[PDB]
Design an enzyme around this catalytic site. Structure first.
Site, PDB file in Angstrom:
ATOM      1  N   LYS A 230     -13.459 -46.686 -26.178  1.00  0.00           N
ATOM      2  CA  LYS A 230     -13.323 -47.837 -25.302  1.00  0.00           C
ATOM      3  C   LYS A 230     -14.446 -47.813 -24.270  1.00  0.00           C
ATOM      4  O   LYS A 230     -14.726 -46.757 -23.721  1.00  0.00           O
ATOM      5  CB  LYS A 230     -11.969 -47.855 -24.593  1.00  0.00           C
ATOM      6  CG  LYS A 230     -10.833 -48.273 -25.507  1.00  0.00           C
ATOM      7  CD  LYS A 230      -9.486 -48.160 -24.826  1.00  0.00           C
ATOM      8  CE  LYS A 230      -8.348 -48.383 -25.809  1.00  0.00           C
ATOM      9  NZ  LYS A 230      -8.319 -49.776 -26.309  1.00  0.00           N
ATOM     10  N   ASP A 241      -0.160 -47.236 -23.690  1.00  0.00           N
ATOM     11  CA  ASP A 241      -0.158 -47.618 -25.089  1.00  0.00           C
ATOM     12  C   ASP A 241       1.088 -47.085 -25.826  1.00  0.00           C
ATOM     13  O   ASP A 241       1.196 -47.183 -27.047  1.00  0.00           O
ATOM     14  CB  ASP A 241      -1.465 -47.140 -25.732  1.00  0.00           C
ATOM     15  CG  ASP A 241      -1.866 -47.959 -26.935  1.00  0.00           C
ATOM     16  OD1 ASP A 241      -1.601 -49.185 -26.948  1.00  0.00           O
ATOM     17  OD2 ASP A 241      -2.464 -47.380 -27.872  1.00  0.00           O
ATOM     18  N   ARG A 304      -1.591 -49.733 -35.725  1.00  0.00           N
ATOM     19  CA  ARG A 304      -1.087 -50.289 -36.985  1.00  0.00           C
ATOM     20  C   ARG A 304      -1.077 -49.219 -38.091  1.00  0.00           C
ATOM     21  O   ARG A 304      -0.171 -49.185 -38.934  1.00  0.00           O
ATOM     22  CB  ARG A 304      -1.877 -51.541 -37.399  1.00  0.00           C
ATOM     23  CG  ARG A 304      -3.327 -51.294 -37.836  1.00  0.00           C
ATOM     24  CD  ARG A 304      -4.163 -52.564 -37.804  1.00  0.00           C
ATOM     25  NE  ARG A 304      -4.383 -53.016 -36.430  1.00  0.00           N
ATOM     26  CZ  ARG A 304      -4.954 -54.165 -36.065  1.00  0.00           C
ATOM     27  NH1 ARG A 304      -5.396 -55.036 -36.978  1.00  0.00           N
ATOM     28  NH2 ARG A 304      -5.070 -54.451 -34.769  1.00  0.00           N
TER      29      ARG A 304
HETATM   30 MN   LIG Z   1      -6.449 -48.795 -29.755  1.00  0.00          MN
HETATM   31 MN   LIG Z   2      -3.405 -48.559 -29.221  1.00  0.00          MN
END
Ligand SMILES: [Mn+2]
Ligand SMILES: [Mn+2]
Ligand SMILES: [Mn+2]
Ligand SMILES: [Mn+2]
Lengths: 455, 455, 164
Positions: A230, A241, A304
């Site tokens: 990031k 998260d 995911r």
């Molecule tokens: Mn991520």
């Molecule tokens: Mn994430």
């Protein structure tokens, strides 16, 4: 008057000359303090707006505004739920006032180096008790999300869930190391590998004597991005998260108090996504529990990949059989661009389940909008190497991520996906019953959804 | 066999040994050419997929695939609409095959330095005629969008609409210069001022002898961004920012052919958004036709500012009275992040109008999803100087833009807003009946919406 | 004294808050003329050819790209009772010019005349206080805009002192 009494006022209701002189016009959440009639205590006049337009959210927000204006008082009595004239029945008023009071009092002071009693005045004692429990669960989720990732590591988060399960009477299994490897959660293992903190997998079951619902919660305790790191200089609440896992855990802790006649299993993959000499690589392929393959085109679309195998495990045909699966995840950053910071995305192919979740969210005062599982966006899942990619590098990732998750839900199992990345963390100042930071978003929607499903 | 005959085949239908040897499996849009039985002409076997799952879109796409595979033939007969076994009635098959043929043949060769007949075989002659007309209107919109902005300037676009109105029998008024100034469309004037090409405003009315519907179309013929100049090195189809105006104009041209018993007025603000010594400035305030004010915080959010005054004009109480207003605009770039490149956003507070538009889009085979007019996003319209801003610089601009437009729709007038920035221009290769570039998106949805409204 | 100082501050606040499309260089010059007249201050406004004669080639070059022509204003407080000169930057709108400010970054581009605002407002307060000193305000006013005729990167300005 027990130090402070808060009185709800709809538009047109009478207040003293002092409140009028201060500009009290019964605007929702407006608070004007004044001495009580006998001069010995404090009265808060709190606005409820016009009676004809007031909703449960109005009462929830007014209660939060009341507790914020309490000052140094030791005891606070809220009379807000005794205001009638609106369309909100007494029980709903009591429930909402109770929720708002707890939610409005919430503080997270654990890492910093006089209020002793909030009382809700009403005959609706049952509704108050339900409101307090729902709000307390929300606050548990808030704590978990606010917790620094260095404290709430995947191993520490697993320990915390074990302790919470023990309190509540919930059955709990924690998987780690070799025991974890046996489950074939290869997405979790691959994503978690780069970190010095090893991943965990936790199953929680509420199983009263009185359908089996599966809840899947994304528990990335720290999302740095991995090798697709990031950008530094952009702000991200990387510790937040695991908000999906938080919402699922907290919802599960509230069920024994409510005594809902339904079996509910929580499935919680927990990991850090870190850059490292041994981190998951762009171009790597994960072979999932169902034998299908995912090419890792971007390491920051890790959630995911972690959820995939858990959804196979949760939905596969087998012992006792999970009749429906709901996943909750701070999954996507694309959604917020369209929907804004305070609305979650709901995906499901099942129209009646959609209605159940949306109506639950309305009762809870949490904003969701349904997004379609667009068939024409499946083309963006294609990979030149594996069965699918985890990132198309094209527009529409929120929808693509939902379609990606759909691939792992066993045929015929009703499923819903809640993407809550934005509303799980408030990066603006506090408003109404919502603090800065971890919000506990989706906890109350989940509880309301499970209630409706149990009926 | 008239050079080429195209035969529709559902899964399981018989084809010759040659087609089988080539791998024809009746997959939707799959085309295998073969000699006719007599050896004198060409047969195309065209896949329609399983009979039980075929929709009108399947026929539309199969027709497009047929015309693409025509080769150098002079005549093409499509028999696709004679394939039965599916749930799509004969009239819908004929309509869709007709649309797909025209849409699939579309080419834009005007700026580059043998097919003489497409015939659709069916008894449903009326349905064919409607399909051809709808598709021709779509292609008109495609031409307008594809047109270089230096050719389709606001003055030239106004002239083109005047010519189209004259053909169709539509009443047309073009406003310019002082005549334009009198209308009080101060958003249009302010946005358009920087360009050497002066702005225009055009009203079109379809008024058959047989409710009054208002259509508002954003006609920014070239959107550079203005002083908030679009970054060079990013690609933008800046000439395509008049796609909404194109869709409205084209829909209006189709109405006399259909003979719909309803009055429909088109309202088309036309301008260029250019940087210049005299261009609209960040921090400037526009005073609109309703007396309210908008602070220009970003010059690239110009469309909403241009549309504002037109929506006041279109919806104000007055002569003969527009009963409902639908605006169509390539308005927002935020939507696409969530929804992807092929889906438009629909906004309306009216649930029955929402259903009417969505069902119309389904019949037309155009993808829309409804987004909510989130009350909590109005806070992002606030300005420190004026009544509102045109840009919050926060997430949620697609929703914020809809709420912004809502401010200018007179009380009690049903209204819908169609944001079609992404699907109005296809920046990927051609697929099905959709070419590269200008798509004419929303034309057919509008026609279908007006049909339902007339019934 | 407090009220007068604060009122002057608020005058500057208004000028800075004013949308640049209202407070153009010509309009800002008119406003200063009106304020000077109220206060008894001597005021000269230079424009067009009259401005060109002064040799303020920096002002002219920077201002050239805009449709709003630049202005130069001198204000003098000269009571009957040292001479202090106040110079205030009055860029009524700073887009960046051809070196255009990045879109997507926020800039209060209308606020680039805050220096001129402070000088004008300070000058308006002096007659109320009755300070025994002569004070001249010097206010160059312009927009910095991109345009077909805007100042270019690599161009050279020859200033009033002959330096470049
Ligand atoms: Mn991520
Ligand atoms: Mn994430
Ligand atoms: Mn724009
Ligand atoms: Mn535009």
């Amino acid at each position: 008057a027990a130090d402070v009494v808060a009185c709800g006022r709809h538009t047109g209701a009478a207040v003293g000359a002092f409140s009028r002189r201060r500009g009290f016009v019964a605007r929702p959440g407006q608070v004007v303090a004044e001495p009580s009639a006998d001069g010995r205590a404090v009265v808060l006049n709190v606005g409820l707006g016009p009676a004809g337009s007031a909703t449960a959210a109005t009462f929830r927000a007014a209660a939060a505004a009341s507790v914020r204006a309490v000052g140094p008082a030791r005891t606070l009595r809220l009379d807000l739920a005794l205001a009638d004239g609106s369309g909100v029945p007494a029980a709903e008023r009591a429930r909402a006032v109770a929720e708002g009071a707890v939610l409005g009092l919430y503080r997270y002071d654990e890492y910093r180096s006089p209020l002793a009693e909030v009382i809700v005045a009403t005959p609706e004692r049952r509704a108050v008790a339900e409101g307090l429990a729902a709000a307390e669960a929300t606050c548990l989720a808030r704590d978990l999300v606010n917790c620094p990732a260095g404290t709430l590591t995947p191993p520490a988060f697993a320990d915390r869930i074990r302790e919470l399960a023990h309190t509540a009477g919930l059955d709990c299994a924690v998987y780690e190391g070799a025991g974890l490897t046996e489950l074939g959660l290869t997405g979790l293992t691959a994503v978690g590998r780069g970190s010095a903190e090893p991943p965990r997998y936790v199953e929680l079951t509420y199983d009263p004597p009185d359908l089996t619902v599966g809840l899947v919660g994304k528990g990335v305790t720290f999302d740095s991005g991995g090798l697709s790191l990031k950008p530094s200089g952009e702000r991200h609440a990387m510790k937040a998260d695991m908000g999906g896992a938080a919402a699922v855990v907290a919802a599960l802790t509230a069920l024994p108090r409510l005594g809902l006649p339904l079996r509910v299993r929580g499935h919680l993959p927990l990991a850090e996504n870190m850059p490292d000499g041994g981190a998951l690589r762009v171009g790597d392929v994960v072979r999932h529990l169902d034998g299908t393959t995912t090419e890792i085109t971007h390491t920051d679309n890790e959630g995911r990949v972690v959820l995939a195998d858990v959804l196979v495990r949760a939905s596969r045909p087998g012992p006792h059989r999970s009749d429906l699966v709901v996943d909750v995840a701070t999954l996507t950053s694309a959604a917020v661009h369209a929907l804004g910071t305070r609305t979650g995305a709901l995906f499901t192919p099942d129209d009646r389940l959609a209605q159940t979740v949306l109506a639950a969210s309305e009762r809870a005062g949490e904003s969701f909008c349904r997004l379609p599982l667009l068939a024409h966006e499946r083309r963006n899942l294609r990979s030149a190497v594996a069965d699918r990619v985890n990132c198309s590098h094209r527009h529409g990732d929120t929808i693509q991520a939902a379609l990606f998750l759909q691939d792992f839900v066993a045929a015929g199992v009703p499923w819903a996906h809640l993407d809550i990345a934005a509303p799980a963390y408030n990066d603006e100042g506090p408003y109404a019953e919502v603090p800065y930071g971890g919000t506990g978003f989706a906890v109350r929607t989940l509880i309301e959804t499970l209630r409706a499903l149990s009926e």
